[PDB]
Amino acid sequence: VVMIKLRDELGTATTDSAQKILLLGSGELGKEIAIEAQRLGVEVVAVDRYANAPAMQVAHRSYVGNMMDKDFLWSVVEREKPDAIIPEIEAINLDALFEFEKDGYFVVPNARATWIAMHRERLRETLVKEAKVPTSRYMYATTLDELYEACEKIGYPCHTKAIMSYFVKGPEDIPKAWEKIIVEEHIDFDVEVTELAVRHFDENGEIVTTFPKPVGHYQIDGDYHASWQPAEISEKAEREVYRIAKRITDVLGGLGIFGVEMFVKGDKVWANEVSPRPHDTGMVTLASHPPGFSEFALHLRAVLGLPIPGEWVDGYRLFPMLIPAATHVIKAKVSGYSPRFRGLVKALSVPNATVRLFGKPEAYVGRRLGIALAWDKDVEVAKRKAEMVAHMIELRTRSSDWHDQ
Amino acid sequence: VVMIKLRDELGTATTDSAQKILLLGSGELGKEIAIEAQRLGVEVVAVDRYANAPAMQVAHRSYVGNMMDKDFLWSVVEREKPDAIIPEIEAINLDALFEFEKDGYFVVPNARATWIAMHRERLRETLVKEAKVPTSRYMYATTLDELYEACEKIGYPCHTKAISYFVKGPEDIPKAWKIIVEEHIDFDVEVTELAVRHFDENGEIVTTFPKPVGHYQIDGDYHASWQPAEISEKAEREVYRIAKRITDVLGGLGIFGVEMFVKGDKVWANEVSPRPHDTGMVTLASHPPGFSEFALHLRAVLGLPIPGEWVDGYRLFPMLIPAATHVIKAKVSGYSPRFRGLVKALSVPNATVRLFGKPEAYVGRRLGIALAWDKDVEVAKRKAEMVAHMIELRTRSSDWHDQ
């Protein structure tokens, strides 16, 4: 049960009255969290596997070590005694989180949630049995034999992925797609959406769930590429998105923002998966939500025990959107140290847009190095503008040549 | 003249390709400059007279020393070799700034501007003789005789101080006695115009104008500000006109806080600060993300472009939503400040607060702000004030005090 209570007070970072958050993972998402915390005078300690990670250039202090190493994490936690331990990624020692929580440290949203979302089978079963929400047809496969049976039964085209992926359209892709796989039925959906439901305290000290507008997005090879708010869906589906998300978060519990992933086709909605922490597609809220209220600020506030203003409408407590916006990733196509970006004269002259460069010290093929942010009364204009700003930018490394996209 | 040029590229903080700014003064204003710089992967070095000042907490590195000491500043500059030296306050060694500039370092907007704005009468002369913009009528006096002749021509009532007293009639002349005699202006509202000089897509310097910012000063200290100010379209255009003239003379790159008085359609230039101004914190909510006065200054001084919208010969900067701010002032002294009343304060819709992180308080110290937005500026003003006053302050060695 939530380790903390409604908070009415805050002290000052670097002094003895300070509240402190511990970020386990210091990528671009942890960075925005550290920024909101700094804007609130909250002490920030960032942790990750390499030095000068984005969040730690902004943090008061940082620690560098293997985050799958329980001893490392414990040394840090015992040294810092933070008000909140905030996982930014999945690759963190799960036992350590349970131990911190069991010892009285607030693990966001709770240890169990990170554990559940780690195992795809556990998650899907939790979604079906406990949350009782609709999902695409599916079945598991332990061996190539069970795989043939699964793909043949689900019917073609067919989605395949490991529990921790391939797209089979015919019996000939079955072998090429092959352990434990999840075979899913293909749904010709209108759009993929992330519902950024946040569990936080109301003035009575009870936990409520408020919902931001659904976030639309598309992924290039299982990697978020662009997102926008609000997703162009019908009101009926929108209410169904909030309903499914509520069931999911009600089961997960704790405090924090969730990235509930769903598929929308007309008025129909299927639940796919969920991450118990801020999600990359949610970066659009850096522009679509008003200041101090992006998914990062919402997450921070929620886990410190602070309130979040809402707006009740037909049984659901909603979080009002300020202006439609969209983002587009700036991915590296090269490796090397000291990245640099060009094409800013044209990229930064585009109205109602801007970019954010994460500060990652090094690049590898595919590493997200920043995003283009755009806003407009017409979400479709914003989307196109974000893509255009991102595409006007070229990246280079110390030991490589300029490349685009 | 401006020493850098249009910028098309940026490296990465903490690596050898990094661009780097040096903040001379690390209070709340430098803090937001530091935040936008971090969001652009720009390396930040924060400097001030005390440790863990707001901007240092956010910066990559910091230096602490007496900023009136030229040797100290030179040591930092020589060590860091920043792309931009951004003065946050006025109390900085001026010779030092001139020396940096002469040695090839880019002092924002330029050293001369900081020197002029610091010298009250030299600024007043610039405004009149060079900027050629309207200001309050004034004149000087060396002898009681001339004081009488001055007050007489200036009209009553009038203000008088030396290089003060308020004479309402020719009976206080002696009581009032180099002196300056400044007329009085019963203005409707005080406004700050945040003109920004930066490069355009063609590599040429333009000046773009955000909507005028309204505010009211309480004993020299600003208390509340808002955007847009409630003035006529004719006064608004005059504001842009006056600002353009003032900034054309100051030159350089960066944002300016041009202070003016508005009465109906009449506008008077009063003062100018060649750097982000505290009344401008309202842009943290009224302007779009990455475009508050702090990001505008940053982009400008790095030589990066800034989107604008031409309207009647003026390159304007569009506002996102009306907003307002209200200060959170300390009424006590001491270390390790803390704030309560957050359950109610942060439950108010369309508002939030920024707490600066200052490790210590003194009576009158600005410790944070309440921010509020709304389609109706009056509602925003009202809300910020309300949120600010719901907050109470305490120090390690003091009792709780309200606003």
- Give one DSSP letter per residue of B319-347, joined into a string: -SS-EEEEEEE-SS-EES-EEE-HHHHTT
Measured CA to CA, the distance from residue B304 to residue B318 in angstroms comes to: 18
Q: Are strands A61-64 and A138-141 parallel, antiparallel or unpaired?
A: unpaired
Encoded amino acid at A89, one letter: I
Strands (E), A34-76: 43-48, 61-64
Report the residue from B6, B348, B373 with minimal CB separation from A345: B6
Burial class (CB in 10 A: 0-12, 13-18, 19+), B155: exposed
Residue of B20, B21, B39, B344 to mutate when probing chain A, most A C-beta within 10 A = B39
- Give one DSSP letter per residue of B274-313, joined into a string: SS--GGGGGHHHHSPTT-SHHHHHHHHHHT-----EEETT
Q: Does A342 touch chain B (CB under 8 A)?
A: yes
Encoded amino acid at B152, one letter: E
Q: Does A323 touch chain B (CB under 8 A)?
A: yes
Q: Check: CB of residue A362 under 8 Å from CB of residue B13.
A: no
Residue ranges of alpha helices (H) inside B40-127 are: 54-58, 70-80, 94-102, 111-118, 120-125
Measured CA to CA, the distance from residue B112 to residue B132 in angstroms comes to: 18
DSSP bridge pairs for B182? B138, B159
Question: 């971090």: which residue's tokens?
Answer: B38
Residue of B204, B343, B347 to mutate when probing chain A, most A C-beta within 10 A = B343
Q: Check: CB of residue A85 under 8 Å from CB of residue A73.
A: no
Per-residue tokens: B39: 């969001």
Going by the DSSP 8-state scheme, the letter that residue B230 receives in this structure is S
Per-residue tokens: A154: 């689900």
Q: How many residues does chain A have?
A: 405
- SS3 for B32? helix
Q: Check: CB of residue A47 under 8 Å from CB of residue A62.
A: yes
Please name the method used to determine this structure: X-ray
Measured CA to CA, the distance from residue A35 to residue B121 in angstroms comes to: 41
Residue A99: how many CA atoms within 13 Å on its side-chain side?
12
Report the residue from A39, A306, A349 with minimal CB separation from B305: A349
Q: Check: CB of residue B380 under 8 Å from CB of residue B322.
A: yes
**C-alpha A316 chain-centroid distance:** 22
Per-residue tokens: A370: 């920043």
Task: Give the closest residue to B40 by CA, choosing from A393, A258, A150.
Answer: A393
**C-alpha B136 chain-centroid distance:** 21
* CB–CB contact A290 B57 (8 Å): no
Handedness of CA B268, B269, B271, B275 (dihedral sign): positive
Residues of B in contact with A59 (CB under 8 A): none
Angle, CA A351 vertex, CA B233 and CA B229 arms, to 5°: 25
Handedness of CA A196, A197, A201, A204 (dihedral sign): positive
Q: Which H or E run includes B39?
A: helix B28-39
**C-alpha A51 chain-centroid distance:** 22
Measured CA to CA, the distance from residue B41 to residue B36 in angstroms comes to: 9
- SS3 for A25? coil
Residue B132: how many CA atoms within 13 Å on its side-chain side?
2
How crowded is residue B182: how many other Cβ atoms within 10 Å of its Cβ? 18
* Domains of chain B, each with CATH number or no CATH: 1-130 (3.40.50.20), 131-183 (3.30.1490.20), 184-403 (3.30.470.20)
Report the residue from B10, B35, B343 with minimal CB separation from A344: B10
DSSP bridge pairs for A313? A316
Report the residue from A286, A290, A373 with minimal CB separation from B285: A290
Residue ranges of alpha helices (H) inside A218-343 are: 235-252, 285-288, 295-304
Q: Does A206 touch chain B (CB under 8 A)?
A: no
Task: Work out the minimum CA distance from A125 to partner chain B, whole angstroms.
Answer: 37
Q: Check: CB of residue B83 under 8 Å from CB of residue B4.
A: yes
* CB–CB contact B342 A7 (8 Å): yes
Residues of A in contact with B349 (CB under 8 A): 309-311, 320
Measured CA to CA, the distance from residue A58 to residue A41 in angstroms comes to: 13
How crowded is residue B169: how many other Cβ atoms within 10 Å of its Cβ? 10
Residues contacting A98, CB < 8 A, separation 6+: A111, A115
Nearest chain B residue to A17 by CA distance is B336
Angle, CA B278 vertex, CA A18 and CA B82 arms, to 5°: 80
**CA distances to A18, A250, B132, B144, B186 from B140, in Å:** 53, 74, 19, 11, 22
Question: 């795809």: which residue's tokens?
Answer: A120
Nearest chain A residue to B341 by CA distance is A8
* CB–CB contact A338 B291 (8 Å): no
Q: Check: CB of residue A391 under 8 Å from CB of residue A404.
A: yes
Residue of B5, B15, B350 to mutate when probing chain A, most A C-beta within 10 A = B15
Handedness of CA B76, B77, B79, B84 (dihedral sign): positive
Q: Which H or E run includes A187?
A: none
**C-alpha B325 chain-centroid distance:** 14
Measured CA to CA, the distance from residue B10 to residue B291 in angstroms comes to: 18
Orientation angle between helical segments B94-102 and B70-80, nearest 10 degrees: 30
**Final resolution, Å:** 2.3
Task: Give the closest residue to A284 by CA, choosing from A46, A22, A6, A32.
Answer: A32
Task: Work out the minimum CA distance from A386 to partner chain B, whole angstroms.
Answer: 14
Task: Give the closest residue to A29 by CA, choosing from A49, A53, A52.
Answer: A53
Q: Does B380 touch chain A (CB under 8 A)?
A: no
**CA distances to B27, B109, B180, B225, B397 from B118, in Å:** 19, 14, 17, 23, 36
Report the residue from A12, A290, A375 with minimal CB separation from B373: A290
* CB–CB contact A352 B288 (8 Å): yes
Residue B22: how many CA atoms within 13 Å on its side-chain side?
24
Residues of A in contact with B336 (CB under 8 A): 11-12, 15-18
**CA distances to A159, A177, B1 from A141, in Å:** 13, 12, 71
Q: Check: CB of residue A181 under 8 Å from CB of residue A147.
A: yes
Task: Give the closest residue to B384 by CA, choosing from B340, B339, B327, B299.
Answer: B327
Q: What share of chain A is helix, strand, coil (3-state, %, to 5)?
A: 30, 30, 40
Question: 């880019």: which residue's tokens?
Answer: B106
* Contacts by residues B397-401 (CB-CB < 8 Å, ≥ 24 positions apart): B397/B334, B397/B335, B398/B332, B398/B333, B398/B334, B399/B332, B400/B340, B401/B331, B401/B332
Q: Does B201 touch chain A (CB under 8 A)?
A: yes
Residues of B in contact with A350 (CB under 8 A): 307
Residues contacting B294, CB < 8 A, separation 6+: B29, B32, B33, B35, B36, B276, B283, B284
Per-residue tokens: A2: 């939530």
Residues of B in contact with A368 (CB under 8 A): none
Q: Check: CB of residue A282 under 8 Å from CB of residue A224.
A: no
**CA distances to A121, A138, A144, A178, A263 from A181, in Å:** 9, 10, 10, 8, 20
* CB–CB contact A39 B309 (8 Å): no
Measured CA to CA, the distance from residue B65 to residue B79 in angstroms comes to: 15
Measured CA to CA, the distance from residue A62 to residue B303 in angstroms comes to: 32
Q: Are strands B205-210 and B254-255 parallel, antiparallel or unpaired?
A: unpaired
* CB–CB contact A12 B359 (8 Å): yes
Measured CA to CA, the distance from residue B369 to residue B242 in angstroms comes to: 30
Encoded amino acid at B53, one letter: A
DSSP bridge pairs for A198? A210, A257
Q: Does A89 touch chain B (CB under 8 A)?
A: no
Q: Which H or E run includes B5?
A: none
Measured CA to CA, the distance from residue A259 to residue A257 in angstroms comes to: 7
Q: Which residues of B34-48 are buried (b: 16+ CB within 10 A; e: fewer)?
A: bbbbbbbbbbbbbbb
Task: Give the closest residue to B24 by CA, choosing from B108, B115, B112, B118.
Answer: B108
Torsion, Cα of B346, B347, B348, B353 (10° steps): 10
Angle, CA A28 vertex, CA A26 and CA A34 arms, to 5°: 65
Q: How many residues does chain B have?
A: 403
Report the residue from B307, B335, B350 with minimal CB separation from A350: B307
- SS3 for A137? coil
Task: Work out the minimum CA distance from B95 to partner chain A, whole angstroms.
Answer: 32
Handedness of CA A168, A172, A177, A180 (dihedral sign): positive
- Give one DSSP letter per residue of A206-244, joined into a string: -EEEEEEPPEEEEESSSSEEEEEES----HHHHHHHHHH
Task: Work out the minimum CA distance from A6 to partner chain B, whole angstroms.
Answer: 8
Q: Does B16 touch chain A (CB under 8 A)?
A: yes
Cis-peptide into B307, omega within 30 deg:
no
Burial class (CB in 10 A: 0-12, 13-18, 19+), A104: exposed
Measured CA to CA, the distance from residue A91 to residue A109 in angstroms comes to: 16
- SS3 for A117? helix
- Give one DSSP letter per residue of B160-207, joined into a string: EEE--EEESSTTSHHHH--EEEEE----SEEEEE--EEEE-TTS-EEE
- Which residues in chain B are immediately followed by a break of C to N over 2.5 Å? 163, 177
Burial class (CB in 10 A: 0-12, 13-18, 19+), A120: middle
